[PDB]
Structures are given as C-alpha cells and as structure tokens.
Design a binder for these strands. Sequence first.
RNA 1: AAGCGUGUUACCUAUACUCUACCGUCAGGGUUGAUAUGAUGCCCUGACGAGUAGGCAGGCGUGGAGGUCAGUGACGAAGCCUAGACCGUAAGGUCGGGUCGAACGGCCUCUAGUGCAGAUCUUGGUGGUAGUAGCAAAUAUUCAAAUGAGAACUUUGAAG
RNA 2: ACUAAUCGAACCAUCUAGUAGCUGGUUCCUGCCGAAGUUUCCCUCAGGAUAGCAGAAGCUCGUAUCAGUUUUAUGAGGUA
RNA 3: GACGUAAGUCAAGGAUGCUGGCAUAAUGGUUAUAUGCCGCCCGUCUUGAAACACGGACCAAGGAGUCUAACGUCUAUGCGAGUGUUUGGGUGUAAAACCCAUACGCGUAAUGAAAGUGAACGUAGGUUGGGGCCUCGCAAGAGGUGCACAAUCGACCGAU
RNA 4: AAAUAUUGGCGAGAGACCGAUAGCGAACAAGUACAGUGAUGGAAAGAUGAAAAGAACUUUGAAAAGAGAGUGAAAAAGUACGUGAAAUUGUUGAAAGGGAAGGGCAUUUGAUCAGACAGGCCAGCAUCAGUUUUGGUGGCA
Lengths: 148, 185, 156, 127
Amino acid sequence: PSRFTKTRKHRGHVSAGKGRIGKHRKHPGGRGMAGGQHHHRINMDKYHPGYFGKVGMRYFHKQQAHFWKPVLNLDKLWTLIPEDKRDQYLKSASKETAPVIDTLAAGYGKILGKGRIPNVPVIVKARFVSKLAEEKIRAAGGVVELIA
Amino acid sequence: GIDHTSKQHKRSGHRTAPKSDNVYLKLLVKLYTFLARRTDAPFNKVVLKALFLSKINRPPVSVSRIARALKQEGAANKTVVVVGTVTDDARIFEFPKTTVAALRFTAGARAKIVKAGGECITLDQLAVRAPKGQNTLILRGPRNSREAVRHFGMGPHKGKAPRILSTGRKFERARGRRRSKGFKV
Amino acid sequence: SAQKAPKWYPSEDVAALKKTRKAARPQKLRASLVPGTVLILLAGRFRGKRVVYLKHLEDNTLLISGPFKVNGVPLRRVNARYVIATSTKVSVEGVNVEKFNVEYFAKEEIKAERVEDQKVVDKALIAEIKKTPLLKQYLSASFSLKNGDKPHMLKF
Amino acid sequence: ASLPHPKIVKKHTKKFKRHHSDRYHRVAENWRKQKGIDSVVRRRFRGNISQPKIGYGSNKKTKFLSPSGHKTFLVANVKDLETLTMHTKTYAAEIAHNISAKNRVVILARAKALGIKVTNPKGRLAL
RNA sequence: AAGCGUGUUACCUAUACUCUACCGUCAGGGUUGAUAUGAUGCCCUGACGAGUAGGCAGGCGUGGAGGUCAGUGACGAAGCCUAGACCGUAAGGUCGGGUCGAACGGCCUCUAGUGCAGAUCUUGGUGGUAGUAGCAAAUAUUCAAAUGAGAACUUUGAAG
RNA sequence: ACUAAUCGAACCAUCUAGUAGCUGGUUCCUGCCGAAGUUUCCCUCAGGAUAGCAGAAGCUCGUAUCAGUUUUAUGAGGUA
RNA sequence: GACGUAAGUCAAGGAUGCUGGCAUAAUGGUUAUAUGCCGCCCGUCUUGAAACACGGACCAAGGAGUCUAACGUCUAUGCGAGUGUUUGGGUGUAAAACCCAUACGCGUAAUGAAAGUGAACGUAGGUUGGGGCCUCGCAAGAGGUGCACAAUCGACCGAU
RNA sequence: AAAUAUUGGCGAGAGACCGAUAGCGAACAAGUACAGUGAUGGAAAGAUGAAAAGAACUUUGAAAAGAGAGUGAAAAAGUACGUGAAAUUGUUGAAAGGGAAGGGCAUUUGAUCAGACAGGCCAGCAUCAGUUUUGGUGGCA
Ligand SMILES: [Mg+2]
Ligand SMILES: [Mg+2]
Ligand SMILES: [Mg+2]
Ligand SMILES: [Mg+2]
Ligand SMILES: [Mg+2]
Ligand SMILES: [Mg+2]
Ligand SMILES: [Mg+2]
Ligand SMILES: [Mg+2]
Ligand SMILES: [Mg+2]
Ligand SMILES: [Mg+2]
Ligand SMILES: [Mg+2]
Ligand SMILES: [Mg+2]
Ligand SMILES: [Mg+2]
Ligand SMILES: [Mg+2]
Ligand SMILES: [Mg+2]
Ligand SMILES: [Mg+2]
Ligand SMILES: [Mg+2]
Ligand SMILES: [Mg+2]
Ligand SMILES: [Mg+2]
Ligand SMILES: [Mg+2]
Ligand SMILES: [Mg+2]
Ligand SMILES: [Mg+2]
Ligand SMILES: [Mg+2]
Ligand SMILES: [Mg+2]
Ligand SMILES: [Mg+2]
Ligand SMILES: [Mg+2]
Ligand SMILES: [Mg+2]
Ligand SMILES: [Mg+2]
Ligand SMILES: [Mg+2]
Ligand SMILES: [Mg+2]
Ligand SMILES: [Mg+2]
Ligand SMILES: [Mg+2]
Ligand SMILES: [Mg+2]
Ligand SMILES: [Mg+2]
Ligand SMILES: [Mg+2]
Ligand SMILES: [Mg+2]
Ligand SMILES: [Mg+2]
Ligand SMILES: [Mg+2]
Ligand SMILES: [Mg+2]
C-alpha cells in the first residue's frame, strides 16, 4: 500500500531520492536491452554470458508432447503403491505375489536409477528404464516389463 | 572531538527477536529468554537464537536426516531438536524409534515418527523435560541448497547459475560460453 | 471517548526518602567575633549602628545589646554575616545573658518583661562603657562610608 | 494536589517558527526543515533561528506534565471521567471542546464528587 | 610606541578539554515458584551525538473503508477568527473566547487522486506603481432663455 | 516574395501525454548511518554499464582472523 | 570504610537543617518595545551564490515516483516433496462467503547442438575446522559424537 | 443456434469512485454564450430562509438610497442573499520610527495570562557532598 512507500518519506525533500546532480531523466542509457553489445557489454558478458550469437540445429514445428517422458527414480519407486497397502508388500517379500507398479499410469515415462530400494521383488512396468535402474530392480528380485 | 576508530552507534546486526508476529512463537521466546538467563546451559542460548531466525535460515529438516543423525554412535537415544519444520522423506524405509522436538511437523513426518514408536514434542515440552538441553541433538537443514544461492557470486569463471527465465538452446549458450563463439566465460 | 485510555497507569504510591547522611554540627564563628566586641550592623532597621556582642545563640544568631540607653538598639538577634566585628571590646563578665535564647524572641505594644531584661543588661554594660573615654559617644554615632573609604583596606 | 515531582524544565520554551514565516504570508509558522543547499538555517550560521533537535527533549520524569503536576486526560462524559477515579494525583480531566453546556454541568459535579481536577472548569458557563 | 627584534609573567575567551545534569542512540546486563500483574515492560552499567547526495527507522497530518467507544452534537457538529491557555524536540495535539448552523470525532486496523513557497507552474482573486502616464492631429467657440435635482456639452434664439 | 496580422512549405483536427543523454520543478517531522567526482569498456567526452565509496538486512561464531603502527631478521629499488 | 572496648555514631554507594517575606501578577509565561552583541534572500545549477547567475509582486485553491505485466534479493504466513480452491463446476443470506473433479503450472534430474544417455565402492566417502550434546573432571581441561557452514581430495550422472 | 464481443442505443442494479478549479467540456436555457471566412475552437455559471413571511408604514433625499419601524429562530440570512478564509483596504485603539524592515541570545519597561494554602513563590544563614578558583601558613628532600 501507498502509505508504506518511500515516496511518502521523500515528501519535503526536493530530489525525491533521485539526486541533485544525476537528476532522474527519461531513458539516459537507452530503452530495453539497448547497447547490449556497445555500452552495456560489461554487464551483459558478466551476468549473461552466451546471450549473443547462435547455437546448434533448428527444429521446425516442434511439439513437446513427442518428448513427454517424466523420470522417476527408484528411491521414489515405492511411493506409487498407496501407503495403506505398502507395508503389506514390504513385509513377506516374495515372488508369486509381487506388487505390479504401472509407472505409466502414474505419469512417468522412464525409470532412473537413483537407487536403494528395499530388497522386495516388484514388477515395474515402464516405457523406458536406465541400465542401472533395471540392475537394481533385478538385484532386488523384481523385473521390468516393457510397455508402450 | 574524538578520533573514532569504530563506526558510532552501530547496531549488532543480529536479530534480538523474531520478526514474526506469531503470539505462540513469542511465548516460546519468552520461555527460552528466561531459560537462557537463569541457566548457564549453552543449549538454551542456541535454541533462543534459532527461534529468532528467518525462514531461509531455518531450512526443513528431513526425517531421514534425523535418522542419519541417530546413526551417530552413542546418539541413538538422544532427543533430536529442530528449531523449525520436520518434513517426511519416503526415501528411507526403516525409521528408528526416537523423540523429536520441533517447531513444526508435517503430517507425513509426524505419522512416520509415531509409526516408528517415537514421539513428537513441542519446544516447551522439551524445555520441561530437558531444561538444560540434556541429552539433546540439535539438527539443522541445508542452507546452501536454496535455489537463490545458485545465483550468488555470478561472474566469469565462477561457475554459478545465471539468473534466467527460459532455459535450453538459444538461452545464454553461445558467445561467452564456448570457444566456437567468441570465448568461454 | 475523546481520549481512549492509558493501558497501564502509573503507581499512585509516594516513595520514601533515602536515609540522608547530613549530621548537623555546631557552627564555627569567625575568630573576630568574641563576646563583648562592638559590632557594626550592615543591614536591617538598625543599619550602621554600633552594638555590643553579648552571646552566640543556638540558632547561630548573635545576641546584641548595643545599649538601648545609648543608641536605642534593643536586646535583639543578628546574623553573623551581616555584622562587622571591630577591635574595640568591653568585658561582658558583669552581665547575665543565659536567660536569653531562641524562645525568648518568638513572634506570637512592647511586652513588659523585655524592658527590665534590657534595664538590667544596660546597667552592667553602661558601667564598663563609662570607664574608657569616648566609647559611649562612639556607640551612639552611626557608621558610614565616607568618600574614598576602601573597606578592603579599612581596619575595624 | 498532584504527586510530588521534580522541578519542571522545558529546555526550550520558545516556539520553533519556520524560517521566513515572518517574511512571507504564504509560508506558515509550522516548523519545516530547511533543505536548501545554501540555507543559513540548515548550515547553522551564527545569529539564525534554532532548530528542533532531540537534545531539547524533556526530562522523562516530567514530560507531559502540566504546571499543576498533572497529565491531561480528555473527557467526553462521566464514564471517561470515572476512568480517573483512582488516579487523581497524576491525571486531571479536561472536558472535550464539543461537549454541551448541560453535559459539562454533569461532568463537573461528578468530578467534584470524585476529587478529580478539571483543567477547564469554565467552558460554556452561564456566568 | 600603541613601531621593530627579543625575553618574562599576568590576563581575555571556542559549539574544543575536565566534572555534573537532562535528551536521544548504541552496547552490555538484571528482573517470573505474586516479576509485588505494563517482559516490544521496568531497571542497572558504559560509551557515543557534525553532515550535502543518499539509505534506513520511529512518528505527525489528510480523503475514504471494516471494527469498537451502546463516543460528541440544534442545550450547537463542522468550518473560520482569536500578540488568551496548556502538552510535544518536532510534524502536530488539546482547551477557552467570538462567529456559525448539521453534522463530526477517539482508538484498533484497511486503503489512497494523502501534506507545497518556488515549476517565466494552472485557475481565480488582489496590490504597490497611482489618483500617476495620460484624456494635446482634424482652426472655435460665445451670450441669453427654456428644460431639469443638476447644464461647458440638451433645445431654441442670437453670434462667431 | 505572396498564398486571410501565419510562409526556406498555410491553416484545422487527429496520430499525440510524439522522443529528449538537455532546462525547470518535485509537497510532513524527528532519529541513526553516511558518499562520489576515481578504474575498465562504450559513435564514449553534458550519457551509460562496470568496480569502488554508502545504507539496509542480517548470518556464523565469541576475542579470534587481525592492524594505513613499530621492533627484530631478511629482501628488493637506482630517485636525492 | 572510619571512629568507639561496646553501645552506637560519622563528612563512609548523590542535601539536609534552621529562619524570614509573599501567596500575588510578586516569581514565571506570552506579547510589544528598548538596549548590548550578532544575523546578506530564499529556492537552484555549481569547484565556488548575498551575488552585477536564474525563478520568485502578493493570496487562496489545484499541483508531480502512480498503476499494471513479468521479474531479482530480503521478510511474514500456509502447507511441504509437494504446492496452487476462484478456467470452470457446486452453492449462496448473490459480484461476497462456503465446497470441488480432471487437468495445467512450477518443483521433485541433469546434461548434450543433437541422436541420446541419465546420478551410493564406501555407515551417501576421507582430511581439517566446526556450535551444541555426551563421558570423565571441584574446575581448568581431556576424551567421544559431531548438524549447518568453510576449505580440500575423492566417488557418481551427462558432454568431450 | 449456443458458448464469444460490445467507450453506440434502450431498460435496470450498483461502488472502500469525484464532490462545483473535482467529477464528462457541460450538476445551471452546455456543445450553450463567444471566436474564426472556414475546417474547427469553445467557456464561465450550484446553495436566502422551514416558509417570501422578499421589509406595510414614518421620515430625509430630485433619486438611488439612508435612518427608523417591521418579518424571520437568525437580517452577524435583504435575491450584491449559507458559512464567509487569505491577499488587499477603511476606521478605532496601542506602539515604534536620524538612508529599509524583518530575525537570534539576554534582560529592562508596558500590557496581558495560567495555577495554588486541603505546601505554592522568592530568599537568608549553618553544617555537608561534588567540581573548581583565589589566599595564608607548617614540615621535609
Ligand atoms: Mg537529505
Ligand atoms: Mg532535481
Ligand atoms: Mg514549547
Ligand atoms: Mg515549537
Ligand atoms: Mg555549499
Ligand atoms: Mg615587543
Ligand atoms: Mg547526525
Ligand atoms: Mg478519515
Ligand atoms: Mg461550533
Ligand atoms: Mg492573526
Ligand atoms: Mg440547514
Ligand atoms: Mg496529488
Ligand atoms: Mg502556493
Ligand atoms: Mg521547494
Ligand atoms: Mg496627468
Ligand atoms: Mg509534448
Ligand atoms: Mg557520522
Ligand atoms: Mg563502436
Ligand atoms: Mg547541467
Ligand atoms: Mg640513476
Ligand atoms: Mg627512473
Ligand atoms: Mg515582559
Ligand atoms: Mg553584523
Ligand atoms: Mg561556473
Ligand atoms: Mg543561494
Ligand atoms: Mg538557466
Ligand atoms: Mg523574475
Ligand atoms: Mg508566477
Ligand atoms: Mg493545496
Ligand atoms: Mg467543471
Ligand atoms: Mg445564525
Ligand atoms: Mg457573521
Ligand atoms: Mg446566515
Ligand atoms: Mg455563497
Ligand atoms: Mg454571506
Ligand atoms: Mg485579511
Ligand atoms: Mg527620509
Ligand atoms: Mg534587534
Ligand atoms: Mg565543597
């Protein structure tokens, strides 16, 4: 709100905090990103390196949905089982009754390997997996089933 | 006239009170101001100062951080003290039975601690049972993992994060970042 | 309400004084003031009168009777700081003055007793005043500064 | 009477009138800080007016006291006056300017009954 | 010498130095089983105080909004005047008296088209100048009567 | 020269609150702190960016790390 | 602390005692004037303004850092590996308040131009400090643990 | 067709909006009066009182009007109408004044003003304390 601003305190002081000598003017150095290569070069090279110039290939008509692939790590893999039913699988860890985790229905494209799941076998259905993530799942006694 | 060696009238620069208007927090400060004055236990003075801190200066402490702290040898039966918020962490699958004293608990963190057989305690109940901070383990969260910290000290060859809205190709990955375009920072 | 209220009011209690270490001790008069000395008064209705110093009372007043039969100055008190002490002295070992004190001079037509308290004292004082020459006329004359008198060089 | 107080010292009884408020009618006497670059008042040249500064602050044991030794409490009715029932040695009632004559009569009689001093016991009187 | 060189003392006086008080600021402390209920409170101790540009902090004032004072008011609200009074370092606040005629405050909060001496500032009002500069080109007016409150100036007559 | 008291491009309205590194002004009080006119770059020289000087917020600790100072020991220098 | 054998006293962590006049314009305040000494006209640009630099004859009223989109640091608050009810739906005492699904955004993964690949040798490492806590000690100190943070050497992910 | 738009038109309900120099240019016979050949430009201007009850009548004046009287709660509401500021001005009163005036500190003089007797004002002496200033004198090296 207006009453807490420094404008209120500057009332009675001539320059309004803008200085007598410098004397607040309209656009003393230019508008927007003017002079980014001329009189704003130092700032721009110090705080935005890489700003000017070109980079690799162009992609005409890029649709992000082609690239949709949310990653999920193993350390969060067991969160896709609801908490009420989680502890039953964590105990009695055995095959012939192993939790099927459909990571795609959970909204994930690829399972990565940040690692250290419990030693309980689980059936991980995924579109993609990292090599180490499938190692840790198999080491735990589970399996990854490729789905589409 | 006096040839002043030091700046006159300089404030300490340390918080002497919470900026917060939370009445219960100020009551907790009323309690630990008394305890810091009337006891010589350094725990009370440390907790008091931590009670003054700002939000970025009291990061969350995870239950898994607490459990790692309890793995310190000879620490498995110590009352963990967190002047702040304790959050839940599903990345840990075995939580120990311990008493944790904290300003705030999340629902997940409290459920995990209680399901372990442990106890969640307010700082005034800690003051009742450990007036001198007896057998206590003060834990602090990571201050420098804040997103804002990535951008401090930005400059050539410093390797900090530029302040930038859109990321990817075309956004500060050119002249100034590779020898093929000018130079590299 | 025109004025809301003070949330907490000051105490109406009155504090007791700290105990004071000011013990009253007797006044040390100047050496020049010895009973029997003639005194110039410097202030009051009897300005400039020469009187005889008789007794140092307990309120630090001097009891003077510049004999009433000589210059009309009655038995009265004076402040030692409003007095010039002279070198001329008449012995007061013939006059009783122990009956005179602070309650003798209380505030509330002359009273009867002070007349004979004066007419007894003046007998003893006039007796020795008649001895040395010119002192009775000296006690009748008033003191004043003439032209060129310098009291910082004057001897009294 | 009031509670015993130390002697009242003001440290500046004279009003702090604005520079050149005697010079121009448009300049009012309410104190204003000279902020001009060349101002003799701002620079504190000898012979110029004195400016308000914290060193003039009144003794805290005597601040807000009237010469009678009482703080003023503005009163609009009997209830506001009875706020000072147990505070007669430190506070004096002052009837608010907009109180009517017939209500002032009621306030004065109540104040006399309770021993409360009234700083303006003559406003709107038939005398 | 009341001049010049030199020597000796006394003496004068700065917002400087010593001590004391008061204000504020900073710092370090004290104070809870009635702190003899103000703990952003009260109290103890020490040091410090120049300031443009500028930063920050605590306050003062104005229009409107939620709440409260079952606040004020035609027995007079507000406004205005007042070398009358009081409080505050100050922004300001309060009271008395006059004028006046219908509304308006205190406190806790919310909000802003929120504070003027200046901008050859805008609009409006008003001065000094000053009863001043002036009312002097076109040749020129005069007598009498009438009218009228009033006639250099209107009308009529006479005349130039 | 003239083109309605307007002419080295009339007048009216709008775009239009046109832009200005330039001139002028920028409205209460008190308290505390307290500058710079120098470095580098710039169609830069009446302007900016940059660093510095400054305030504010603090935080981690609690007499250290120190220091516009000397001493001791040991270097270096090519001005008087 | 001193004095006194003790009683107790004292000039020893800040004035008491005695006495007088007046109780009002007497002291004091305000104001006008006088007297001594002092005091150049503000604002502004400026190295430098009282300037023979500029604006200002006077007065009143008006009069200039705003709002918005996106954002940085800091702070308060809610919840927390999540978070955001308000596009919309339900509902209502109807622009309020109350309730809510599916999504979407930001976060929870990086890196490469890209195709792609994608985070534990180890108690999630070693070393140096490190508040606090623990054990032993009258204490000092010694020993154990050591979160945040700091320096540093490694390990892991991607690029080469 | 509907969901969308809508500084125009018509009909409604509203506001932490403005309150007569504001708010539309215009609260009013306002796009009026007025300017310009013309396109165009374009104001200022609200408030007596509850009711005109808007002052009959006398008197002075050639008259405006004045003085009375009267109406009204009020004429300190008389259509030059609510209140009625400042600049500027008249009168009366006070005061000062040899080429400005105004200001600061202090006090004199004049004028003016507040409060208190259940201690308020101004002083004097004594014995002390703190800080100082100026004398006298003693003992030692
Ligand atoms: Mg300033
Ligand atoms: Mg300026
Ligand atoms: Mg004052
Ligand atoms: Mg003042
Ligand atoms: Mg200057
Ligand atoms: Mg000489
Ligand atoms: Mg200062
Ligand atoms: Mg208001
Ligand atoms: Mg009124
Ligand atoms: Mg006036
Ligand atoms: Mg009315
Ligand atoms: Mg404005
Ligand atoms: Mg003005
Ligand atoms: Mg100005
Ligand atoms: Mg003339
Ligand atoms: Mg323009
Ligand atoms: Mg300073
Ligand atoms: Mg170039
Ligand atoms: Mg310039
Ligand atoms: Mg050489
Ligand atoms: Mg050389
Ligand atoms: Mg006087
Ligand atoms: Mg002078
Ligand atoms: Mg120049
Ligand atoms: Mg100047
Ligand atoms: Mg100029
Ligand atoms: Mg001019
Ligand atoms: Mg002008
Ligand atoms: Mg104004
Ligand atoms: Mg208008
Ligand atoms: Mg009236
Ligand atoms: Mg009137
Ligand atoms: Mg009227
Ligand atoms: Mg009017
Ligand atoms: Mg009027
Ligand atoms: Mg006037
Ligand atoms: Mg003359
Ligand atoms: Mg003078
Ligand atoms: Mg002494």
